[PDB]
From a paper:
There are three parts to the flagellar structure: the trans-membrane basal body that functions as the motor, the connecting rod and hook, and the flagellar filament that acts like a helical propeller. Our current understanding of supercoiling in bacterial flagellar filaments, referred to as polymorphic switching, is based upon the notion that protofilaments within the flagellar filament can exist in two discrete states, that differ slightly in length. The “short” state results from a protofilament having a right-handed inclination (the R-state), while the “long” state results from a protofilament having a left-handed inclination (the L-state).
While the three L-type mutants (E115G, S285P, and [name]) have a left-handed 11-start helix, the four R-type mutants (N226Y, A233V, H84R and A39VN133H) have a right-handed 11-start helix, and the designations L and R correspond to the hand of these 11-start helices. Strikingly, we found those sites are not necessarily conserved among different species or participate in unique inter-subunit interactions. These include three straight mutations outside of the D1 helices: [name], S285P (both within D0) and the double mutant A39V/N133H (within the loop region). Therefore, mutation [name] or S285P in [name] forces a local bend of ~ 30° in the helix axis, and this conformational change makes the D0 coiled-coil adopt an L-type form more easily.
Residue numbers in the entry:
A (entry chain f), F (entry chain T), J (entry chain d): 255 to 304
B (entry chain A): 52 to 152
C (entry chain f), G (entry chain T), I (entry chain p): 3 to 51
D (entry chain J): 153 to 254
E (entry chain J): 52 to 102
H (entry chain M): 204 to 254
Write the structure that this text describes.
């Protein structure tokens, strides 16, 4: 029961933990796409009004 | 009229400067807020695990909390727009005397 | 209009997003939410005693 | 020799830090209280003193020694609580720096 | 203001350097700790198997 | 943790670093357009009042 | 009026703009903000030790 | 040796040396820019009234 | 941001995880927690006498 | 134990070794992109001010 308690201290919901690993990767890649596009916009600003 | 547009344009500059100021303070407040959420988690953790968590690790929790207190103090201090400590909670206070704001 | 745009808060999310994914990684590898990091050093110290 | 961290764009907006643990630090009454309270960790009274006396002395009878270990664990635990607190300070620090900086 | 961001960015560098330092010491302390756990096992073993 | 520290010394935000690579190229090309046009103006000055 | 105009500060920006893009390049290629250049030779020397 | 407490070697006055030096060159460029603007309207008057 | 990431503590777990599995193996094969290794050379030496 | 020692002489952390194979390929390709773009810049310099 002690190792069960300590387990609860150090439990992982590997389902959740992997799901948020996944999700945080999705959000990373998403934010990356947003930075690419953030670079794409002002390129257009200048080149369409240079 | 062109006077009115000169004052207009400078007032739009003042408006934009407004937006960046208010967004500076705002974002800082959302950071404070994120702390406060972790803090609340540290209240249900400073729930003492009800009573299971003894004084030692209550003091460890306290280390994390007071650390975060110094962080919020750091938000209210560091947030100096043009040198103006926006989140000085005593700076714009409308006390009994309005002039103190 | 076109010279300070870099989606600067996105850019601040990205290393925090990566950071998050590395925290996730870090726990998945150990299989343990207990990290070397003293974040929740109380719960740590508890299961340490 | 306080390991402060410079944080504010203003000077002296700093983060105090403290570290005091070492192999010769264990159950710090004030410091080493003799062979016990730092030096069971260092000197390890397990040779024959324990077989000489196992309970009654408490300074060779296992009691204080397991307390040297246990509190040493609590020192490194509380030290990692200080440090982890500082880590969390650096988390919200850089979050503020990136936000307010942005 | 751009002074404030220059000092800011260098202070974020100093913060990160902080994180790696504090994590260095921290992880080292968890290694010490792992020892201390084995040590405690070696106290109940230096329990002399009782006698 | 040492390699993590040293990494922080030698980290790049390749997102930012590429974004400013891009941006500095934009500003280069922009300034170039400004030099072309800087040549175009006095051509007109003389030829319209030669 | 029309014989010293070359947008001379633009012209001074251009090799500094190019210079900037080559610094950017230089770090992107290494993937490392650490340059051979001793600009921030402190941070350099730190990660060198 | 000392990072905060002295203020004459503890970073405070020194960052203030930098910051106010910035404010001096800023105010100096405010004087100069003021003079530039004076030369703008000056030559505008000189060309107008001169014409 | 993307050039020193290899999940370095994971990577430090992996040979310790393998090491663990080889300790497990080693005892399973002998059917004996007593190893050639002097880890717990006391208990070893005890059952040796 | 001899073959274990010699193994330690000739051990590979195939995880690390593959990770740095990968990484060095990434850094190659990255540097390549930087050379392409290094060619792209002066093209623009001349053609925008030829």
């Amino acid at each position: 029961n002690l190792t069960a308690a300590e387990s609860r201290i150090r439990d992982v919901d590997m389902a959740k933990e992997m799901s948020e690993f996944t999700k945080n990767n999705i959000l990373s890649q998403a934010s990356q796409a947003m930075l690419a596009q953030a670079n794409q916009q002002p390129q257009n600003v200048l080149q369409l009004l240079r | 009229m062109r006077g009115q547009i000169r004052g207009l344009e400078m007032a739009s500059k003042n408006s934009q400067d407004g937006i960046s100021l208010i967004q500076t303070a705002e974002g800082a407040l959302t950071e404070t807020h994120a702390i406060l959420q972790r803090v609340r988690e540290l209240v249900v953790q400073a729930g003492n695990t009800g009573t299971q968590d003894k004084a030692t690790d209550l003091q460890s929790i306290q280390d994390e909390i007071s650390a975060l207190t110094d962080e919020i103090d750091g938000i209210s201090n560091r947030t100096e727009f043009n040198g103006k400590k926006l989140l000085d909670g005593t700076y714009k206070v409308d006390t009994a005397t309005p002039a103190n704001q | 209009i076109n010279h300070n745009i870099a989606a600067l808060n996105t850019l601040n999310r990205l290393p925090s997003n990566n950071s998050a994914s590395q925290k996730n990684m870090e726990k998945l590898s150990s299989g343990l939410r207990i990290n070397r990091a003293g974040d929740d050093a109380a719960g740590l110290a508890i299961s340490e005693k | 020799k306080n390991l402060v961290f410079q944080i504010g764009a203003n000077a002296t907006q700093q983060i105090s830090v403290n570290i005091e643990d070492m192999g010769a630090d264990a159950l710090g009454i004030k410091e080493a209280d003799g062979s016990i309270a730092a030096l069971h960790s260092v000197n390890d009274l397990d040779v024959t003193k324990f077989a000489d006396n196992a309970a009654d002395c408490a300074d060779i009878g296992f009691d204080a020694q397991l307390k040297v270990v246990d509190e040493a664990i609590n020192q490194v635990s509380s030290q990692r609580a200080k440090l982890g607190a500082v880590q969390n300070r650096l988390e919200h620090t850089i979050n503020n720096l990136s936000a307010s900086g942005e």
